[PDB]
């Protein structure tokens, strides 16, 4: 027997590396500097252990999303003059009228201006007296006039010499052997949607509703859900604002609200009522497999906390809504209509749970309509006394890994090793 | 045809028929330097394997016979239960301890064959 060297054998080892775009008026997620796109092979006899909570494709996607956010915030206006004292009178307790003194293009003169601020942006200091909410411990940098926020599908294509393994099991709860894997050059399209308490536009489970969590017996860990049929939602903002351009320096301009046109009608997002009861009924059937066939599943409303996390906040049309989902989560369960949700708007944003970095979103002249999907929740359990038959699932969320960890629960990146030596009966003369 | 890594679960004997398949898929602002440092790694990683073949003398070949004799203390199974019961993922553990000294006998078995063919030409 004589050693023989083979180059190009199918062996792989776990690894972690850097992935890049591929994606077919500038977007924040700059689809103008990502590679253009272009292939799925079946691996037989193969069984490959997975784990979706010790994934690393997630901790790279959370940093790439943040760092794309605040490079598209650097190059344009910084509104540090707006921290002054306002004299705000009621427009009619929701809108204010808020006139103040602010500079001109001539450094020594002053200007008297005005603008309409929502009540969620001014905190008073004891007409009346007010100031902007993020003025102590933040620095407001206006959003920037010609950049969009709408998500665009991005494919995460791995480098050459690495490969991405995809679990095609149709009931995969993200942990354990997957007897049917594949090999993909790069993923399907993942929309980087920002949301809370309800995952929007999603991607649907194939056969049944799936409940996924890190440590079920622990009550401090969230519980991602994944519907298998969408439950579409309908948002609107009736009023029709006007845009006015304050000038606050040489080459700066502050896009403030002008006048409302009409009566003030609240902004909402409805639901179909009968659909929301079937869907909440298929969740309970699939949620008894993990807690007991004779247990009372009681849904409740938000527990409390910061307004970014006790309410269903999202972003469509360019104007950041903050809806109040209490009528969705109700209805204790034992063994034409529409639900109307009252949504409030803001204009100064603190997105990624950062401290001391904020943003001001210019108004959207026009009427805002919005047609979304609801393809998941993020519940959380309340720890009882282990001697009851009732479980209360309040919606939670906030942490942002949990949105994306619901899309990269099936992928795994590996590293090829193409060199091998084996015995044979050949000899080199 | 089976494709890239298609023969991952097949036996060592029928998965040596698809060496060219993996052999041609090993080379090819936030996105501006994530891109650039990803290519200078796929190349430097690849050139450290085409140099190893050159040292042993197998350059440009996928299957290459050598002169080292298979020591019976590395794996003492017979040929019928290596090329017909194993998969490369299984065979590549069993010699995980003895791969760093097979690479040391292949390297200097060629250095002796360089200075044996060089002398022979002198006559």
């Amino acid at each position: 027997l004589w050693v023989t060297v083979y180059y190009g054998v199918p062996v792989w080892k776990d690894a972690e590396t850097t992935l890049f775009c591929a994606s077919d008026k500038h977007n924040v997620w700059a689809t103008h500097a990502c590679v253009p796109t272009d292939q799925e092979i079946h691996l037989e006899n193969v069984t490959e252990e997975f784990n979706m909570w010790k994934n690393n494709m997630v901790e790279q996607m959370h940093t790439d999303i943040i760092s794309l956010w605040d490079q598209s915030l650097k190059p344009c206006v910084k509104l540090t003059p707006l921290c002054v004292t306002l004299q705000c009178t009621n427009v009619t307790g929701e809108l204010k009228n808020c006139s103040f003194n602010m500079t001109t293009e001539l450094r020594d003169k002053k200007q008297k201006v005005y603008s309409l601020f929502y009540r969620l942006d001014v905190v008073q200091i004891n007409n009346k007296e007010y100031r902007l909410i993020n003025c102590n411990t933040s620095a407001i940098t206006q959003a920037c006039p010609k950049v969009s926020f709408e998500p665009i599908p991005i494919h995460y294509c791995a480098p050459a010499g690495f490969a991405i393994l995809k679990c095609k099991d149709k009931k995969f709860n993200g942990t354990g052997p997957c007897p049917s894997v594949s090999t993909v050059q790069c993923t399907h399209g993942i929309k980087p949607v920002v949301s809370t308490q309800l995952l929007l536009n999603g991607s649907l489970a194939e056969e049944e509703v799936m409940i996924r969590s890190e440590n079920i017996t622990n009550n401090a860990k969230n519980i991602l859900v994944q519907f298998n049929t969408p439950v579409q939602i309908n948002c609107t903002r009736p009023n029709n604002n006007t845009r006015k351009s304050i000038r606050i320096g040489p080459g700066q301009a502050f896009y403030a609200t002008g006048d409302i046109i009409g009566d003030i009608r609240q902004a909402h997002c409805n639901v179909s009522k009968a659909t929301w009861n079937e869907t909440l009924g298929k969740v309970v059937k699939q949620l008894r497999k993990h807690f007991g066939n004779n247990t009372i599943i009681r849904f409740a409303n938000s527990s409390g906390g910061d307004l970014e996390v006790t309410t269903h906040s999202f972003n469509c049309g360019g104007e950041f809504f903050y809806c109040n989902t209490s009528g969705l989560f109700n209805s204790t369960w034992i063994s034409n209509d529409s639900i109307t949700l009252p949504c409030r708007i803001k204009q100064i944003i603190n997105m990624w749970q950062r401290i001391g970095q904020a943003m001001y979103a210019p108004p959207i002249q026009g009427v805002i309509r919005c047609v979304s999907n609801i393809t998941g929740l993020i519940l959380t359990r309340d720890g009882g006394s282990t001697n009851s038959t009732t479980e209360t699932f309040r919606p939670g969320g906030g942490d942002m890994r949990d949105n994306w960890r619901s899309e990269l629960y099936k992928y795994k990146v590996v590293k090829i090793e193409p060199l091998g030596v084996a015995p044979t009966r050949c000899k080199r003369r | 045809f089976l494709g890239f890594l298609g023969a991952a679960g097949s036996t060592m004997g029928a998965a040596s028929m698809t060496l060219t398949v993996q052999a041609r898929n090993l080379l090819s602002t936030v996105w501006g330097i994530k891109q650039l440092q990803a290519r200078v790694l796929a190349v430097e990683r690849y050139l450290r394997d085409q140099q190893l073949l050159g040292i042993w003398g197998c350059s440009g070949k996928l299957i290459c016979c050598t002169n080292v004799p298979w020591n019976s203390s590395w794996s003492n199974r017979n040929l019928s239960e290596i090329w017909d019961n194993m998969t490369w993922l299984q065979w590549d553990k069993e010699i995980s301890n003895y791969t760093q000294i097979i690479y040391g006998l292949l390297e200097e078995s060629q250095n002796q064959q360089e200075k044996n063919e060089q002398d022979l030409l002198a006559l």
């Epitope: 776990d14 069984t47 252990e49 784990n51 052997p177 440590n215 | 993922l89 299984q90 995980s96």
Partner: antibody
Framework: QIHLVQSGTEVKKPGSSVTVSCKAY?????????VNWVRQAPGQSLEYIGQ??????????HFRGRVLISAVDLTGSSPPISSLEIKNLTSDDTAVYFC??????????????????????WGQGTLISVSA | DIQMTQSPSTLSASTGDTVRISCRAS???????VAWYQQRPGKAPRLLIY???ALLGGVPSRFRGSAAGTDFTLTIGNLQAEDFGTFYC?????????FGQGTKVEV
Amino acid sequence: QIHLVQSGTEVKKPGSSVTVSCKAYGVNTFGLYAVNWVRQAPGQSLEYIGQIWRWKSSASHHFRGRVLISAVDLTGSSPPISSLEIKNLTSDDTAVYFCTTTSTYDRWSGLHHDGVMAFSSWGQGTLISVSA
Amino acid sequence: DIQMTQSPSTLSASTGDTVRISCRASQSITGNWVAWYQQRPGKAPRLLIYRGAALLGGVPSRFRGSAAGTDFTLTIGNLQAEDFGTFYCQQYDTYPGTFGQGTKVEV
């Protein structure tokens, strides 16, 4: 951390059946771990009974037909759990019974030779005595 | 099925001594697929060397084993008084993985 807790002491009579269970606190789930049941005759060499691995249990070459290894995964109330019954018990089968688990996530671990395993997290021991 | 005749059947030494323990297979294990335990009286055995010479976490580096052919040997450095007990060499080369017989280390 990982902690293993087996049931308590028990005594039986020949011709009966007895069950011992093992509740593991800290196992992610039995998909990524494997459970092997061993036995130590009084002051003797150890002995291996059976196992569950990737959810397919099997028994040894001297026990087949007289044993049943079963297990159930996580649940909002109890940790993952495994069980062992000994049917047609006899005076020979008195010994201490251990519950053992090994990780099987990493394919290049070295604690498992494609099914045959080394044991890295041991229980506490259950003593089973049969007499009249 | 592999069988191992662990030897010496029992040895004794005091602290500060270097101790070797042998273990022989019946066939050759050419992958270094053996492991070593330690059973204090009554408690449960603790794995401390797997795959020839690899050391689990937490086990002090004072231990060491070697692997060659059919002779597998375990060595203890500068012995310490709580390290008296029993040891076991197990093979996991082929199904099923049998154990040794045990060799106490009395004071």
